[PDB]
Design goal:
Blueprint: H1 2-12, H2 18-27, H3 30-33, H4 38-42, E1 55-57, E2 62-70, H5 72-77, H6 79-96, E3 100-110, H7 115-128, E4 132-139, E5 148-158, E6 173-178, H8 195-211, E7 216-219, H9 224-234, E8 239-243, H10 256-261, E9 267-272, H11 277-286, E10 290-298, E11 302-307, E12 310-316, H12 317-321, E13 345-346, H13 349-354, E14 373-378, E15 381-388, H14 391-394, H15 398-415, E16 419-428, H16 436-453, E17 457-463, E18 467-468, E19 471-472, E20 476-485, E21 496-503, H17 508-523, E22 527-529, H18 537-545, E23 549-552, E24 562-568, E25 578-585
Parallel strand pairs: 3-4, 8-11, 16-17
Antiparallel strand pairs: 1-2, 2-5, 3-5, 4-13, 6-9, 6-10, 7-9, 8-10, 11-12, 14-15, 15-20, 16-20, 18-19, 21-24, 21-25, 22-24, 23-25
This protein binds chloride ion.
PDB class: ligase
Keywords: TM1246, phosphoribosylformylglycinamidine synthase II, structural genomics, jcsg, PSI, Protein Structure Initiative, Joint Center for Structural Genomics, ligase
Assembly: monomeric
Length: 586
């Protein structure tokens, strides 16, 4: 950071003040500034045509707002609060895009079932009234001191009511509303989320939106007021004057820097016209929340922080918003290596959560235990959500392991009859200074798999420096794929014959032929499982919900394969290999 401090100093052309030291230590942290990934992110094919990240057109009438976020570091320190607060943060993120958060999909990676993590997510999810539609849960001792908590949230928003994630013109104002601001953010880095407040924050924000009051928005998370306001105006090439004496407080004797940087939970930034502001506060008050007009959007691209008439801070806004950028490494993929089988156990999400009185996937077209969460929006309209990763492969080869994870997310989406629309991604990695090439290999694999598949990146998250005594975690890119599907066309499991369709090993040049085979068979109403292990206990237990028994002879499969299980009355006719292996009956 001494390097960064020297950059800051050159840019300001003087010693930074106490407040600038605090402000930049947040904004230029890897968590906020993305110094090691920004360049890699610029090389990702992204969803242009969408005027905000995370929001993807579905049928011209509805979009889906979705994003995945990590909460690894808090969760290692306090599993329960870390996980619960993780859920609360990603809900606010989706909300800010203008969507009623309506679906949660968890991606958990741990040495063990950490009760506090499963319970923190369950309890919070139960209290906010937002359903868990699925979970990917992987168990490996390689994760013992660094559990990964990735949470994906989604919701539907009218195309005629999208919320911008920027300020738009000088003279707009910014309202901060929701929970009051305390001294929040080792145990000092843990915050206590409360779902009851966030539940009121959802209703109040959606009410504001409906009235036409929200002209832009951003959730408060890391960095608090500073992050939200600097970024709103930085994205619109504007400035802000922030009046800290106006933030509603929970502890009155806070110093201005403490108000600026507090990471108190359940807060929202709303950009509006100054004449709409008293109605916004009217609504927040009605919903038992705290609110005030806090910043003025200005034309000069300066970030000026006030406490009453006291200048707290003034810097160029684009200095805060653009952390120093670390050079990329050019990564060159060699041949696909042979993979070993590495011990990663899968846990049934529905089984694990059921113990904390928490349902998974109840309002879905088909159970997510079969591989993808399918949601009904209208009679002939819906979407799908898939969360997938292959850290067991990325361990051995980071590029190919990562690329396959993406390709397999496509298989899963096609398997329910859905067409891939977009990816949200969570990069979970160790130390990029120690190991630059691993990060490079991940980012390039994401870049090339998006290219190979035609599926763009909509949103994402990077969590770096996941280590214990310098031992890095397995490089884990969590892929969350959005797909489009007619729920009327989704196959349910039926008494049928089972076939292994494809090849027991992997060659990139035949993946698209498998996809074409899945598509064809899906169009004809076949039920299709696509899983690394081919068939799992989760599959078996899910079939029992339908009163069905599987008796199969599974083909021997490599750690990376190009096979799926197709359930149909008669033999699949496809330009891919087909072997009859058993039955599904009763
Ligand atoms: Cl710094």
């Amino acid at each position: 950071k001494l390097r960064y401090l020297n950059i800051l100093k050159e840019k300001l052309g003087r010693e930074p003040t106490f407040v600038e030291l605090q402000a930049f230590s947040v904004m230029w942290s890897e968590h906020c500034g993305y110094s090691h990934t920004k360049k890699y992110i610029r090389r990702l094919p992204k969803t242009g045509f969408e005027g905000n990240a995370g929001v993807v057109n579905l049928d011209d009438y509805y979009s889906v707002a979705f994003k995945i976020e990590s909460h690894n570091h808090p969760s290692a320190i306090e599993p329960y609060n870390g996980a619960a607060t993780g859920v609360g943060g990603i809900i606010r993120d989706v909300l800010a895009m203008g969507a009623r958060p309506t679906a949660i999909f968890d991606s958990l990676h741990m040495s063990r079932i950490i009760d506090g993590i499963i319970e923190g997510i369950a309890d919070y999810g139960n209290s906010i009234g937002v359903p868990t539609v699925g979970g990917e849960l992987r168990i490996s001792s390689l994760y013992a001191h660094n559990p990964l908590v990735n949470v994906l949230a989604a919701g539907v928003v009218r195309n005629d009511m999208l919320v911008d994630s920027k300020a738009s013109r000088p003279g707009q104002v910014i309202v901060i509303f929701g929970g009051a601001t305390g001294r929040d953010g080792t145990k000092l880095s843990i915050q206590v989320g409360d779902p009851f407040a966030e539940k009121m924050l959802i209703e109040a924000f959606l009410e504001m939106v409906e009235e036409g009051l929200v002209e832009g928005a951003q959730d408060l998370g890391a960095g608090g007021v500073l992050s939200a306001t600097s970024e709103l105006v930085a994205k619109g090439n504007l400035g802000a004057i922030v009046h800290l004496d106006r933030v509603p407080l929970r502890e009155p004797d806070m110093e201005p820097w403490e108000i600026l940087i507090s990471e108190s939970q359940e807060r929202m930034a709303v950009v509006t016209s100054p004449q709409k502001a008293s109605r916004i506060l009217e609504i927040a008050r009605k919903h038992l929340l705290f609110g005030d007009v806090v910043a003025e959007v200005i034309e000069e691209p300066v970030y000026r922080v006030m406490y009453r008439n006291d200048l707290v801070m003034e810097v160029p806004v684009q200095l805060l918003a653009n952390a120093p950028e670390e050079d990329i490494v050019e990564y060159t993929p060699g041949k696909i290596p042979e993979f070993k089988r590495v011990e990663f156990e899968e846990v049934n999400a529905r089984e694990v959560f059921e113990q904390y009185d928490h349902m998974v996937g109840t309002d879905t077209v088909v159970p997510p235990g079969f591989g993808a969460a399918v949601m009904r929006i209208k009679r002939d309209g819906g979407y799908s959500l898939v969360t997938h990763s292959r850290a067991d492969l990325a361990l051995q080869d980071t590029y190919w392991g990562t690329l396959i994870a993406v390709l397999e997310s496509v298989r899963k989406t096609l398997s329910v009859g859905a067409e891939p629309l977009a990816i949200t991604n969570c990069v979970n990695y160790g130390d990029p200074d120690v190991d630059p090439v691993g990060l490079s290999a991940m980012m390039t694999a994401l870049k090339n798999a998006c290219e190979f598949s035609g599926v763009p990146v909509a949103s994402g998250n990077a969590s770096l420096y996941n280590t214990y005594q310098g031992k890095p975690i397995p490089p884990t890119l969590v892929v969350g794929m959005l797909g489009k599907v007619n729920p009327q066309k989704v196959a349910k499991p039926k008494p049928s014959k089972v076939f292994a369709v494809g090849w027991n090993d992997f060659e990139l040049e035949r993946e698209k032929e498998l996809w074409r085979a899945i598509r064809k068979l899906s169009e004809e109403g076949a039920f299709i499982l696509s899983s690394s292990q081919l068939l799992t206990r989760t599959h078996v237990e899910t079939f029992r919900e339908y009163g069905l028994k599987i008796e199969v002879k599974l083909p021997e499969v490599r750690p990376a394969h190009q096979m799926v299980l197709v359930f149909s009355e008669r033999t699949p006719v496809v330009d891919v290999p087909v072997k009859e292996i058993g039955t599904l009956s009763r």
